[PDB]
Design an enzyme around this catalytic site. Structure first.
Site, mmCIF file in Angstrom:
data_model
loop_
_atom_site.group_PDB
_atom_site.id
_atom_site.type_symbol
_atom_site.label_atom_id
_atom_site.label_comp_id
_atom_site.label_asym_id
_atom_site.label_seq_id
_atom_site.Cartn_x
_atom_site.Cartn_y
_atom_site.Cartn_z
ATOM 1 N N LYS A 1 -27.907 -32.428 -10.162
ATOM 2 C CA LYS A 1 -28.239 -33.017 -9.144
ATOM 3 C C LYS A 1 -26.925 -33.725 -8.425
ATOM 4 C CE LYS A 1 -32.398 -34.293 -7.736
ATOM 5 N NZ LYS A 1 -32.535 -33.124 -7.214
ATOM 6 N N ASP B 1 -52.622 -34.985 8.522
ATOM 7 C CA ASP B 1 -52.632 -36.465 7.696
ATOM 8 C C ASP B 1 -52.479 -36.072 6.168
ATOM 9 O OD1 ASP B 1 -53.720 -39.118 6.943
ATOM 10 O OD2 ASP B 1 -53.033 -39.205 9.098
ATOM 11 N N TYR C 1 -38.364 -43.156 -14.120
ATOM 12 C CA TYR C 1 -38.046 -41.742 -13.410
ATOM 13 C C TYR C 1 -38.885 -41.805 -11.981
ATOM 14 C CZ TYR C 1 -35.133 -40.788 -17.301
ATOM 15 O OH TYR C 1 -34.139 -40.946 -18.101
ATOM 16 N N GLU D 1 -42.127 -44.452 -15.938
ATOM 17 C CA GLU D 1 -41.974 -45.206 -14.626
ATOM 18 C C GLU D 1 -40.495 -45.415 -14.304
ATOM 19 O OE1 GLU D 1 -42.457 -48.196 -11.627
ATOM 20 O OE2 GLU D 1 -44.045 -46.776 -12.720
ATOM 21 N N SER E 1 -54.002 -48.344 -7.484
ATOM 22 C CA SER E 1 -53.654 -48.014 -6.255
ATOM 23 C C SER E 1 -52.753 -46.627 -6.146
ATOM 24 C CB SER E 1 -52.735 -49.244 -5.694
ATOM 25 O OG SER E 1 -52.018 -48.805 -4.503
ATOM 26 N N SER E 2 -51.920 -46.913 -7.587
ATOM 27 C CA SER E 2 -50.700 -45.574 -7.627
ATOM 28 C C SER E 2 -51.526 -44.376 -7.981
ATOM 29 C CB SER E 2 -49.603 -46.118 -8.321
ATOM 30 O OG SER E 2 -48.831 -46.693 -7.618
ATOM 31 N N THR F 1 -29.684 -34.128 -14.604
ATOM 32 C CA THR F 1 -29.245 -35.172 -13.837
ATOM 33 C C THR F 1 -27.966 -34.853 -12.961
ATOM 34 O OG1 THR F 1 -30.717 -36.674 -15.063
ATOM 35 C CG2 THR F 1 -29.124 -37.663 -13.346
ATOM 36 N N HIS G 1 -36.774 -44.820 -27.256
ATOM 37 C CA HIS G 1 -35.321 -45.298 -27.017
ATOM 38 C C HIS G 1 -35.594 -46.670 -26.742
ATOM 39 C CE1 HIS G 1 -35.366 -43.333 -22.847
ATOM 40 N NE2 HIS G 1 -35.466 -44.551 -22.683
ATOM 41 N N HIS H 1 -41.085 -45.456 -19.771
ATOM 42 C CA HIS H 1 -40.006 -44.671 -19.401
ATOM 43 C C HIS H 1 -40.284 -43.738 -18.339
ATOM 44 C CE1 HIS H 1 -36.152 -42.788 -19.238
ATOM 45 N NE2 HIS H 1 -36.587 -41.805 -18.948
HETATM 46 C C1 HEA Z 1 -34.217 -46.044 -11.818
HETATM 47 C C2 HEA Z 1 -34.362 -46.408 -13.275
HETATM 48 C C3 HEA Z 1 -33.635 -46.021 -14.409
HETATM 49 C C4 HEA Z 1 -33.220 -44.839 -14.708
HETATM 50 C C5 HEA Z 1 -33.060 -43.486 -13.678
HETATM 51 C C6 HEA Z 1 -32.483 -44.598 -15.931
HETATM 52 C C7 HEA Z 1 -31.881 -43.881 -16.362
HETATM 53 C C8 HEA Z 1 -31.601 -43.765 -17.993
HETATM 54 N N1 HEA Z 1 -31.586 -44.512 -18.820
HETATM 55 FE FE1 HEA Z 1 -32.870 -46.425 -18.696
HETATM 56 N N2 HEA Z 1 -33.506 -48.212 -18.233
HETATM 57 C C9 HEA Z 1 -34.004 -48.861 -16.994
HETATM 58 C C10 HEA Z 1 -34.068 -48.041 -15.899
HETATM 59 C C11 HEA Z 1 -33.634 -46.620 -15.762
HETATM 60 N N3 HEA Z 1 -33.048 -45.932 -16.643
HETATM 61 C C12 HEA Z 1 -34.716 -49.784 -17.270
HETATM 62 C C13 HEA Z 1 -35.345 -50.740 -16.212
HETATM 63 C C14 HEA Z 1 -34.622 -50.203 -18.577
HETATM 64 C C15 HEA Z 1 -35.053 -51.220 -19.625
HETATM 65 C C16 HEA Z 1 -36.330 -51.669 -19.435
HETATM 66 C C17 HEA Z 1 -36.347 -53.114 -20.212
HETATM 67 O O1 HEA Z 1 -36.373 -53.319 -21.491
HETATM 68 O O2 HEA Z 1 -36.976 -54.109 -19.381
HETATM 69 C C18 HEA Z 1 -33.911 -49.069 -19.200
HETATM 70 C C19 HEA Z 1 -33.489 -49.036 -20.678
HETATM 71 C C20 HEA Z 1 -33.040 -47.860 -21.384
HETATM 72 C C21 HEA Z 1 -32.639 -47.675 -22.546
HETATM 73 C C22 HEA Z 1 -33.158 -48.757 -23.690
HETATM 74 C C23 HEA Z 1 -32.063 -49.540 -24.099
HETATM 75 C C24 HEA Z 1 -32.394 -50.870 -24.777
HETATM 76 O O3 HEA Z 1 -33.358 -51.559 -24.405
HETATM 77 O O4 HEA Z 1 -31.907 -50.865 -25.907
HETATM 78 C C25 HEA Z 1 -32.154 -46.683 -22.672
HETATM 79 C C26 HEA Z 1 -31.746 -45.982 -24.166
HETATM 80 O O5 HEA Z 1 -31.560 -44.906 -24.288
HETATM 81 C C27 HEA Z 1 -31.884 -45.913 -21.447
HETATM 82 C C28 HEA Z 1 -31.220 -44.594 -21.279
HETATM 83 C C29 HEA Z 1 -31.429 -43.970 -19.924
HETATM 84 C C30 HEA Z 1 -30.814 -42.875 -20.041
HETATM 85 C C31 HEA Z 1 -30.173 -41.928 -20.844
HETATM 86 C C32 HEA Z 1 -31.102 -42.337 -18.552
HETATM 87 C C33 HEA Z 1 -30.657 -41.224 -18.032
HETATM 88 O O6 HEA Z 1 -31.722 -40.734 -16.996
HETATM 89 C C34 HEA Z 1 -29.375 -40.929 -17.008
HETATM 90 C C35 HEA Z 1 -28.791 -39.721 -16.643
HETATM 91 C C36 HEA Z 1 -27.756 -39.707 -15.500
HETATM 92 C C37 HEA Z 1 -26.303 -39.577 -16.070
HETATM 93 C C38 HEA Z 1 -26.001 -39.228 -17.408
HETATM 94 C C39 HEA Z 1 -25.229 -39.721 -14.705
HETATM 95 C C40 HEA Z 1 -25.326 -38.416 -14.196
HETATM 96 C C41 HEA Z 1 -24.766 -37.017 -14.769
HETATM 97 C C42 HEA Z 1 -23.745 -36.503 -14.731
HETATM 98 C C43 HEA Z 1 -22.594 -36.871 -13.586
HETATM 99 C C44 HEA Z 1 -23.271 -35.340 -15.609
HETATM 100 C C45 HEA Z 1 -22.650 -35.608 -16.879
HETATM 101 C C46 HEA Z 1 -22.595 -36.501 -17.692
HETATM 102 C C47 HEA Z 1 -22.707 -36.769 -19.137
HETATM 103 C C48 HEA Z 1 -22.274 -35.287 -19.669
HETATM 104 C C49 HEA Z 1 -23.105 -37.648 -19.977
HETATM 105 N N4 HEA Z 1 -32.314 -46.545 -20.563
HETATM 106 O O1 LIG Z 2 -36.059 -46.431 -19.154
HETATM 107 O O2 LIG Z 2 -34.604 -45.771 -19.002
HETATM 108 CU CU LIG Z 3 -36.574 -45.374 -21.300
#
Ligand code: HEA
Ligand SMILES: [O-][O-]
Ligand SMILES: [Cu+2]
Ligand SMILES: CCCCCCCCCCCCCCCCCC(=O)OCC(COC(=O)CCCCCCCCCCCCCCCCC)OC(=O)CCCCCCCCCCCCCCCCC
Ligand SMILES: CCCCCCCCCCCCCCCCCC(=O)OCC(COC(=O)CCCCCCCCCCCCCCCCC)OC(=O)CCCCCCCCCCCCCCCCC
Ligand code: HEA
Ligand SMILES: CCCCC/C=C\C/C=C\C/C=C\C/C=C\CCCC(=O)O[C@H](COC(=O)CCCCCCCCCCCCCCCCC)COP(=O)(O)OCCN
Ligand SMILES: CCCCC/C=C\C/C=C\C/C=C\C/C=C\CCCC(=O)O[C@H](COC(=O)CCCCCCCCCCCCCCCCC)COP(=O)(O)OCCN
Ligand SMILES: CCCCCC/C=C/CCCCCCCCCC(=O)O[C@H](COC(=O)CCCCCCCCCCCCCCC)COP(=O)(O)OC[C@@H](O)CO
Ligand SMILES: CCCCCC/C=C\CCCCCCCCCC(=O)O[C@H](COC(=O)CCCCCCCCCCCCCCC)COP(=O)(O)OC[C@@H](O)CO
Ligand SMILES: CCCCCCCCCCO[C@@H]1O[C@H](CO)[C@@H](O[C@H]2O[C@H](CO)[C@@H](O)[C@H](O)[C@H]2O)[C@H](O)[C@H]1O
Ligand SMILES: CCCCCCCCCCO[C@@H]1O[C@H](CO)[C@@H](O[C@H]2O[C@H](CO)[C@@H](O)[C@H](O)[C@H]2O)[C@H](O)[C@H]1O
Ligand SMILES: CCCCCCCCCCO[C@@H]1O[C@H](CO)[C@@H](O[C@H]2O[C@H](CO)[C@@H](O)[C@H](O)[C@H]2O)[C@H](O)[C@H]1O
Ligand SMILES: C[C@H](CCC(=O)O)[C@H]1CC[C@H]2[C@@H]3[C@H](O)C[C@@H]4C[C@H](O)CC[C@]4(C)[C@H]3C[C@H](O)[C@]12C
Ligand SMILES: C[C@H](CCC(=O)O)[C@H]1CC[C@H]2[C@@H]3[C@H](O)C[C@@H]4C[C@H](O)CC[C@]4(C)[C@H]3C[C@H](O)[C@]12C
Ligand code: CUA
Ligand SMILES: [Mg+2]
Ligand code: NA
Ligand code: NA
Lengths: 79, 514, 43, 84, 58, 227, 259, 46, 79
Positions: free
Chosen positions: B319, B91, B244, B242, B156-157, B316, B290, B240
């Site tokens: 993966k 468990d 991930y 959150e 909870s979390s 990323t 950001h 942020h």
């Molecule tokens: C599952 C949820 C999730 C995930 C995984 C991510 C992943 C990423 N997010 Fe995002 N993001 C959100 C959920 C998520 N985000 C949410 C909810 C918001 C808004 C919050 C709000 O205002 O309410 C947000 C907002 C947000 C902002 C703010 C924009 C704004 O409000 O003005 C930014 C800015 O940098 C950002 C960037 C990124 C980046 C760089 C990644 C990176 O982790 C992504 C990396 C993945 C890749 C790049 C693709 C796979 C890679 C390859 C195939 C390799 C080759 C690629 C290159 C060489 C580029 N995200």
């Molecule tokens: O939070 O991207």
């Molecule tokens: Cu973020």
């Protein structure tokens, strides 16, 4: 008196996007100067640069609030 | 016996089932809210009311989808069901505390409901920024009920995180090192560390908002020397990590699904996958600002946050390419779960790439607080987190229930959902580039065509949600009991049959050290 | 995966019933609220 | 880095009791004397109704809404000044 | 005091089928019922308060 | 302003907005390429009966999938950061204008010489003159001189707002107790539209920004006219 | 029927009553803040205390009286307690962040200085220094208690633990008096906000930590601890050192540097 | 001890598929309906 | 405003045994005031209080060195 003023120039003390302290400092500087030119026997014309800068930069409501508090005796900056 | 079993549980499988039921119900609530959003925007003008009722809906939509659907399903549901089975443990470490992490969630949800029923609701955004969320612009109980809802979800979390870390470190077979545990177990461990460290900061920040609203503190009130921007730092230091947290268990499930339906005994590049998840978790703590590129920060700080954010693309991408390399050479089984996972790989990649666009603080000036951001995160959430959820649900439903789904129906469901989410969110890139702001109940006339199409997409996804319910019903209605599955030698969670007995691994596995 | 034949097979007619009931359970309450929106914005 | 002792033949209860009574509790005694020297009440300052102090954005949920939880009439003025 | 742990070990290992939160005897049952009654009643009461607070009142 | 069926950015009205357009083109090409390569490779992995299911060594290929993305990231970050530092450069403006956000309208202050201030409210749809734009017009526009460097200072007298003009590349949050600075330079006369860009309550959707860019002599005439 | 060493826990009502107690405390705070009533809040506080009492009572039954705490189980609880303390460190980090944010960049409303105009800080060489010596001393005495227990010495374990608890109570009474004497209040801007919320959450943890030590004291009086097996004592000592270290950070940051 | 096996490790019965359909319909339907009725409540309130 | 100056009064900014900064600050203040006046036209007589205080407090050799370095362009304080 070395004028032709247009707007407040760049000030290396306040180079960033947040300009709050620039408005604050010139408001203080104007009123500290104006107090010195009264209690010691001079002319406020010497204080005019700070007056123009703070008037250019400061929201009217900030100036108005600060003036009210200076009159009330609650202004928290040192003049 | 029913109350003892389902209200007093100390069993990781039954508690996982409770989380899955809770998260499914929450998914219906969040889907309904999303349709109300898209109904408001589905033609120009006003349908419901002004921005207050509209943004109560938006705010609730986000909280329900994140805190009551994704995290309970992935971490409480799949995590509780699968982690102990995958390490041969009998468990979780704290089986009774585990039940409290579950039962804190219905009260959390009730508090969210209450927030929306009293006064005019909390129309703040899920970010809850002051002063809009303060006691002058949001007087009354709604925002405080929202804060308390988050407090209970947070506890909870946090307790769940403590449980998962302890279980995973302490309860493996004595011969199994951390580098012999499955990738989904790794993904839950890393998610749990992120929760442990990030939620207490959120809790600090929303507690300061509570005291600003009720005890005359001024943490965020300039009249007292406070700063609204401080709240944003505290919120995003959590927020942020959150996102991930929302995707990492999804990565772990995708690794297992792609491995399984490629007919492989193992994912490509296991240690690289562990490295990449740990790297993403670490980098996820140093990029939060950001979310703040337009608040007035110094240029050097904008440069640092641009750069640190983009570097997460490197692990990323490892993966993504490793999943592709796991497909490579496989005997591909085109199961419905495989379809979810393939859709995940591509659509998560699109959303990640528009995230990298937004990381550039110069371009983010024009894209921030527009629908470009909405398009970014619904590609990684509606087409990433959710696709991993659907793939894991269809893949493991026969393990949890003992019954098979109808594969043809499940493939139809995938097809409908794929069309619906892409019709909903792809046009939102255009709306963002052309300047449509976030959190708007109505838009200038030029934005009509793409809003109309996006709302039409949202109805197609509704049809998929309804069909899923029918598909689950059909499986329980027909009662096709599982006999065997393939690849049990590399998928230990299946080796006690379907469903596994209430107690499993009463005699632990034998694993020696050669 | 392999499985026993269904214990209680669900015919196409039974599936049409289950599907219809499922869809109606989502559509009718929301439909009723949305149909009466104007009736709500005036009370 | 400033200390000055020895002790480590092998550490145990006797050593930690020695530290408790020979260092720790004497330090508390001395700080207690220091504090019971500088006790006694400072000259309370003129009231100035500064707008960043005595904040009231919502009434407190106790008393008359206008008193802090551990209000001390001698040293805590209300927004309108010291009480009578 | 004297060490009476062995007698509590005998009590709490008695093969009587009771779960640990009730194995101390009748006092456990009373405290449980007090706790659960306060929790369930308090929860019902919180629901009444929602209903009251959900509409314009005072 | 945006126009029907628009796919990309509003036409650039400032030099910095043009730089952003060219930088977006560059970055979108990379986004399209990587997206399409991943889609292509998925189809490649799925379209052969040939198999290889024994253990594969990962070390060699992971050099390529870290080094190549690292190089791509640098090729994005280099022009991105150049534009960033460009935006930040000292430029010495000839005019400072303040705007204060409110629920739900903007006010403007021109206090370099005269103490001019006024409020700027959305025109309700029922009052639009024929051919005017729903949700976008205001009663009092921000009159400004074209082809000149202008300092805009942004704050708020109540909740957060954000002051945005997409075709000039501008978005600066309006935060009470804080005075945020941005620089504005229009290459052309005309009317330039934007909308409140931080959720601020009931009428967030309905407090737009309209700039009115005119030649300096006409700006001076307008200022003189306010005495 | 098991041949592993882990603990399969009896089905329990305390998770449900604890979660319901959280509902009652939070809805009760809402009722207190907005509808002039403390009723729900009092019920929630009562059920929370009942829940904690019965849950930890059962953990004692399961371990001292039933033998379920094998070394593997004990090792899990060690991890659990460390992880819990980590989460609490991060909670306090949020309040230190707020403090440094406000104090390193004092706004014009404060006078543009720290301490703000009109704030007269406590003298950190008076009661705050005494409190510092009190908690440091209690860190020494709890270590004496730990070694006495390990060496099998009941009398000196009890004496040292009692001294530790007395010092925790002394800290709490000194802090209550300082709160009453402070010329500034929680409503005195961001200075009062950071001061009272951060030291207030710290004072709560002192009371929690003292209560945990008191539980250990009575379990020791009842001979529950062996010289080798006493994890509730270790956990309480770890939590107590955490409370001492947080105080040192508050003292240097808020009382001293921020004065 | 508890019952084990397919259809027995769940807090709801699958003994009768039509009773089950009613249960699942009430379960998912109530979650989907709730936001519409909350919206109606806020609209009607004032 | 009116004299009867005897010596520099107690200054709460400089309450301790080391008065170096008291001398330094009043020297800076005098010359800053002087510079401000001479430019905008006005009268150095408003600067007189700082001049009396720094003259009372500052060793002659410090004043002399500071004056030499201001003339040389090597004075490291800001005027
Ligand atoms: C599952 C949820 C999730 C995930 C995984 C991510 C992943 C990423 N997010 Fe995002 N993001 C959100 C959920 C998520 N985000 C949410 C909810 C918001 C808004 C919050 C709000 O205002 O309410 C947000 C907002 C947000 C902002 C703010 C924009 C704004 O409000 O003005 C930014 C800015 O940098 C950002 C960037 C990124 C980046 C760089 C990644 C990176 O982790 C992504 C990396 C993945 C890749 C790049 C693709 C796979 C890679 C390859 C195939 C390799 C080759 C690629 C290159 C060489 C580029 N995200
Ligand atoms: O939070 O991207
Ligand atoms: Cu973020
Ligand atoms: C292991 C295999 C499965 C694994 C996969 C999981 C399956 C996934 C899909 C799932 C497919 C099956 C769906 C099954 C329907 C369940 C019945 C119990 O049910 C039974 O006893 C049924 C059988 C016996 C009948 C008893 C009589 C019942 C009559 C009426 C009941 C009505 C029920 C509906 C009532 C509606 C419930 C709410 C105990 C369970 C608790 C779970 C949490 C529920 C969500 C609560 C949300 C919080 C609300 C806050 C307000 C929030 C406000 C919003 C803002
Ligand atoms: C599954 C179907 C469901 C139905 C819903 C739709 C799904 C989406 C499929 C849609 C299929 C997408 C194929 C590429 C779309 C580019 C459209 C475009 O012209 O974009 C233009 C730009 C801005 O461009 C400009 O500033 C000037 C534009 C005008 C050029 C001059 C010509 C004048 C006439 C224009 C004619 C149109 C040109 C298009 C030419 C067309 C070239 C391909 O806008 C943008 O940046 C928007 C970019 C969004 C960011 C994501 C990009 C990476 C996605 C790659 C895989 C797609 C995944 C789709 C998501 C999944 C798709 C399967
Ligand atoms: C996990 C997160 C998540 C998910 C899944 C979604 C799903 C959807 N969102 Fe969501 N949305 C957010 C998180 C999410 N959203 C957030 C954080 C915001 C910003 C809030 C703010 O601005 O403050 C937001 C904002 C947002 C907006 C912008 C509002 C505005 O700015 O004014 C819009 C508008 O179209 C939108 C629409 C949709 C739609 C149509 C879906 C649809 O794709 C939903 C379709 C249905 C599903 C995806 C099914 C869900 C159910 C399950 C998965 C359960 C399955 C059951 C079992 C396995 C048993 N969302
Ligand atoms: C014996 C004294 C020394 C020990 C400390 C005693 C109290 C600790 C209690 C817990 C404190 C934690 C909450 C912080 C909230 C503020 C209390 C701060 C400490 C305190 O007690 O502050 C007092 C104010 O309390 C007030 O407002 C009223 C406080 C009571 C109501 C608080 C309600 C809000 C609680 C929210 C908790 C959220 C927790 C979330 C955890 C998630 C994980 C200060 O009194 P004052 O008259 O302003 O100035 C003194 C002038 N003579
Ligand atoms: C400026 C911001 C300030 C914010 C506030 C700051 C506060 C900082 C507070 C610090 C708190 C310090 C508390 C000390 C607590 C002691 C924990 C001791 C645990 C311990 O001593 O146990 C050991 C680990 O120690 C370990 O430090 C593991 C770690 C062994 O553990 P185990 O389980 O046997 O596994 C062993 C496996 N090999
Ligand atoms: C005026 C009164 C106000 C009171 C308000 C309520 C607050 C009080 C909480 C005080 C905490 C008391 C905890 C008591 C735990 C007793 C049970 C225990 O200690 O259990 C021990 C296991 O430890 C374990 O579970 C470890 C269990 C760890 C519990 C940690 C508790 C910390 C709680 C903090 C919660 C609040 C957070 C603050 C808000 C931000 C049992 O194992 P052993 O000791 O080895 O014995 C076995 C040997 O006998 C065999 O030879
Ligand atoms: C705004 C108002 C908000 C109010 C929110 C209130 C929320 C919840 C009400 C809480 C009621 C708590 C009741 C007591 C819980 C005790 C849990 C505990 O002590 O759990 C222990 C494990 O956690 C461990 O050790 C690790 C150490 C113990 C952890 C105890 C934590 C208690 C929760 C406090 C909140 C923490 C938040 C932290 C971050 C800020 C034991 O685990 P079990 O699975 O039980 O047994 C295992 C058996 O082998 C034992 O023999
Ligand atoms: C965004 C998610 C929402 C999805 C849209 C739902 C799709 C439509 C579902 C049907 O809903 C029904 O529609 C009827 C109209 O067709 C309504 O009857 C209404 O209209 C009838 C005809 O005018 C009258 O006979 C009835 O009395 C009156 O209730 C009825 O209430 C409503 O349940
Ligand atoms: C098992 C456990 C279940 C517990 C159930 C307890 C039910 C008690 C409810 O009693 C109510 O209490 C209110 C307060 O909560 C009272 O309002 C009163 O209380 C306040 C003062 O404390 C003020 O609002 C007013 O003076 C006054 O109307 C009100 O008369 C009364 O209906
Ligand atoms: C998920 C839970 C969410 C909870 C959020 C709200 C918590 C508190 C709700 C308010 O509770 C009600 O408040 C009234 C006001 O304080 C009470 O007294 C009322 O009692 C009578 C009701 O009309 C009249 O005497 C008065 O109006 C009034 O004092 C009433 O008894 C009580 O139940
Ligand atoms: C954002 C945060 C301030 C939050 C606050 O206002 O409360 C500050 C505090 C320390 C800052 C960092 C440190 O100053 C160190 C770096 C300095 C560089 O010029 C920018 C990046 C750099 C890494 C800074 C980024 C950012 O401004 C940080 C992290
Ligand atoms: C050393 C470690 C574990 C090897 C093992 O014990 O099996 C491996 C696992 C993942 C590897 C990393 C990943 O493959 C990603 C990077 C790949 C580059 O080719 C070298 C650096 C790089 C960062 C690798 C360094 C190192 O070889 C890592 C960190
Ligand atoms: Cu003002 Cu949004
Ligand atoms: Mg914003
Ligand atoms: Na609309
Ligand atoms: Na020990």
């Amino acid at each position: 008196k070395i004028k032709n003023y247009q707007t407040a120039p760049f000030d290396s003390r306040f180079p960033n996007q947040n300009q709050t302290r620039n408005c604050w400092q010139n408001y203080l500087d104007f009123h500290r100067c104006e107090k010195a030119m009264t209690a010691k026997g001079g002319d406020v014309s010497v204080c005019e640069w700070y007056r123009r800068v703070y008037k250019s930069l400061c929201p009217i409501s900030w100036v108005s609030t600060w003036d009210d508090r200076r009159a009330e005796g609650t202004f928290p900056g040192k003049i | 016996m029913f109350i003892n079993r389902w209200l007093f549980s100390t069993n990781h499988k039954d508690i996982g089932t409770l989380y899955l039921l809770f998260g499914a119900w929450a998914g219906m609530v969040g889907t309904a809210l999303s349709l109300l959003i898209r109904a408001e925007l589905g033609q120009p003008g006003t349908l419901l009311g002004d921005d207050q009722i509209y943004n109560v809906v938006v705010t609730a939509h986000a909280f329900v989808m994140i805190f009551f659907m994704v995290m309970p399903i992935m971490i409480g549901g799949f995590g509780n069901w699968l982690v102990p089975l995958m390490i041969g443990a009998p468990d979780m470490a704290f089986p009774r505390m585990n039940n409290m992490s579950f039962w804190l969630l219905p009260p959390s949800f009730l508090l969210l409901l209450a927030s929306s029923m009293v006064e005019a609701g909390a129309g703040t955004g899920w970010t809850v920024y002051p002063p809009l969320a303060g006691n002058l612009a949001h007087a009354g109980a709604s925002v405080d009920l929202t804060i308390f809802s988050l407090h209970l979800a947070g506890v909870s979390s946090i307790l769940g995180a403590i449980n998962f870390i302890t279980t995973i470190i302490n309860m493996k077979p004595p011969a199994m090192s951390q580098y012999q545990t499955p990738l989904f177990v790794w993904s839950v461990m890393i998610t749990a560390v992120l929760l442990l460290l990030s939620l207490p900061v959120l809790a600090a920040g929303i507690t300061m908002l509570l005291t600003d609203r009720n005890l005359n503190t001024t943490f965020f009130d300039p009249a007292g020397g406070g700063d609204p921007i401080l709240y944003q730092h505290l919120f995003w230091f959590f927020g942020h990590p959150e996102v991930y947290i929302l995707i990492l268990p999804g990565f772990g499930m995708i690794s297992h699904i792609v491995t399984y339906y490629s007919g492989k005994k193992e994912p490509f590049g296991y240690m690289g996958m562990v490295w990449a998840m740990m790297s993403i978790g670490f980098l996820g703590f140093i990029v939060w600002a950001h979310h703040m590129f337009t608040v007035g920060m110094d240029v050097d700080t904008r440069a640092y946050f641009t750069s640190a954010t983009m570097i997460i693309a490197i692990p990323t991408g490892v993966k993504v390419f490793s999943w592709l390399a796991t497909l490579h050479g496989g005997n591909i089984k085109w199961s419905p779960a495989m379809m979810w996972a393939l859709g995940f790989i591509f659509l998560f990649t699109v959303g990640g790439l528009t995230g990298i666009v937004l990381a550039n603080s110069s371009l983010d000036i024009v894209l921030h607080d527009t629908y470009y951001v909405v398009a970014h995160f619904h590609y990684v959430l509606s087409m990433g987190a959710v696709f991993a959820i659907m793939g894991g649900f269809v893949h493991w439903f026969p393990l949890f229930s003992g019954y098979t789904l109808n594969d043809t129906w499940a493939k139809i469901h995938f097809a409908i959902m794929f069309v619906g989410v892409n019709m909903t969110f792809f046009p939102q890139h255009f709306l963002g580039l052309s300047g449509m702001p976030r959190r708007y109940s109505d838009y200038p006339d030029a934005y009509t065509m793409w809003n109309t199409i996006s709302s039409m997409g949202s109805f197609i996804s509704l049809t998929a949600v309804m069909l899923m319910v029918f598909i689950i019903w059909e499986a329980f209605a027909s009662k096709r009991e599982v006999l065997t599955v393939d690849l049990t030698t590399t998928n230990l969670e299946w080796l006690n049959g379907c469903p596994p007995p209430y107690h499993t691994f009463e005699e632990p596995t034998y694993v020696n050290l050669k | 995966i392999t499985a026993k034949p269904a214990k209680t097979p669900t015919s196409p007619k039974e599936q049409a019933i289950g599907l219809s009931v499922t869809f109606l359970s989502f559509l009718l309450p929301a439909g009723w609220v949305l149909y009466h929106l104007d009736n709500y914005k005036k009370s | 880095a400033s200390a000055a002792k020895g002790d480590h033949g092998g550490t145990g209860a006797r050593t930690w009791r020695f530290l408790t009574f020979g260092l720790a509790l004497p330090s508390v005694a001395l700080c207690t004397l220091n504090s019971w020297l500088h006790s006694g009440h400072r000259e309370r300052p003129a009231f100035i109704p500064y707008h960043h102090l005595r904040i009231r954005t919502k009434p407190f949920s106790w008393g008359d809404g206008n008193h802090t939880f551990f209000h001390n009439p001698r040293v805590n003025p209300l927004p309108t000044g010291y009480e009578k | 005091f004297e060490n009476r742990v062995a007698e509590k070990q005998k009590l709490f290992q008695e093969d009587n089928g009771l779960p640990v939160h009730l194995k101390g005897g009748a006092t456990d049952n009373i405290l449980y019922r007090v706790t659960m009654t306060l929790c369930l009643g308090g929860t019902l009461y919180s629901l009444y308060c929602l209903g009251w607070a959900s509409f314009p009142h005072k | 302003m945006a126009y029907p069926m628009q796919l990309g950015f509003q036409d650039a009205t400032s030099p910095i907005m043009e730089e952003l357009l060219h930088f977006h083109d560059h970055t979108l090409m990379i986004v399209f390429l990587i997206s399409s390569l991943v889609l292509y490779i998925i189809s490649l992995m799925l379209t052969t009966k040939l198999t290889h299911t024994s253990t594969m060594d990962a070390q060699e290929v992971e050099t390529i999938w870290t080094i190549l993305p690292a190089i791509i990231l640098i090729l994005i970050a280099l022009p991105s950061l150049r534009i960033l530092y460009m935006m930040d450069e000292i430029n010495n403006p000839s005019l400072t204008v303040k705007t204060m956000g409110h629920q739900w309208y903007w006010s403007y202050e021109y206090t370099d010489y005269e103490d001019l201030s006024f409020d700027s409210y959305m025109i309700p749809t029922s009052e639009l003159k024929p051919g005017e734009l729903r949700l976008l017009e205001v009663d009092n526009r921000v009159v400004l001189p074209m082809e000149m460097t202008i300092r805009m200072l942004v704050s708020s007298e109540d909740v957060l707002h954000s002051w945005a003009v997409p075709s000039l590349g501008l978005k600066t949050d309006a935060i009470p107790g804080r005075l945020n600075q941005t620089t504005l330079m229009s290459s052309r006369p005309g009317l330039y539209y934007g909308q409140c860009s931080e959720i601020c309550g009931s009428n967030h959707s309905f407090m737009p920004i309209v700039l009115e860019l005119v030649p300096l002599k006409y700006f001076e005439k307008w200022s003189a006219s306010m005495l | 029927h098991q041949t592993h060493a882990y603990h399969m826990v009896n089905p329990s009502p305390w998770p449900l009553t604890g979660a319901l107690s959280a509902l009652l405390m939070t809805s009760g705070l809402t009722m207190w803040f907005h509808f002039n009533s403390m009723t729900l809040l009092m019920i929630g506080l009562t059920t929370n205390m009942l829940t904690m009492y019965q849950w930890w009572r059962d953990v004692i039954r399961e371990s001292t009286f039933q033998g379920h705490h094998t070394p593997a189980v004990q090792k899990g609880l060690r991890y659990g307690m460390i992880l819990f303390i980590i989460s609490e460190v991060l909670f306090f980090t949020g309040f230190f962040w707020a403090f440094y944010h406000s104090s390193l960049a004092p706004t014009p409303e404060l006078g543009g200085c720290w301490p703000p105009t009109g704030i007269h800080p406590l003298n950190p060489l008076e009661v705050p220094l005494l409190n510092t010596s009190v908690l440091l001393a209690s860190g020494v005495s709890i270590t004496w208690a730990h070694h006495s227990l390990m060496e099998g010495d009941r009398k000196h374990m009890l004496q040292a633990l009692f001294i530790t608890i007395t010092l925790g109570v002394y800290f709490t009474l000194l802090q209550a008096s300082e709160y009453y004497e402070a010329p500034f209040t929680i409503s005195d801007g961001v200075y009062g906000s950071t001061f009272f919320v951060a030291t207030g959450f710290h004072g709560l943890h002192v009371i929690i930590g003292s209560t945990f030590l008191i539980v250990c004291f009575f379990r020791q009086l009842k001979f529950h601890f062996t010289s080798n097996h006493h994890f509730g004592f270790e956990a309480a000592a770890w939590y107590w050192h955490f409370v001492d270290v947080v105080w040192l950070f508050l003292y240097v940051s808020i009382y001293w540097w921020g004065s | 001890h508890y019952e084990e096996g397919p259809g027995k490790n769940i807090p709801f019965s699958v003994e009768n598929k039509w009773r089950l359909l009613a249960m699942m319909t009430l379960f998912f339907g109530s979650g989907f309906a709730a936001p519409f009725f909350i919206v109606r409540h806020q609209l009607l309130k004032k």
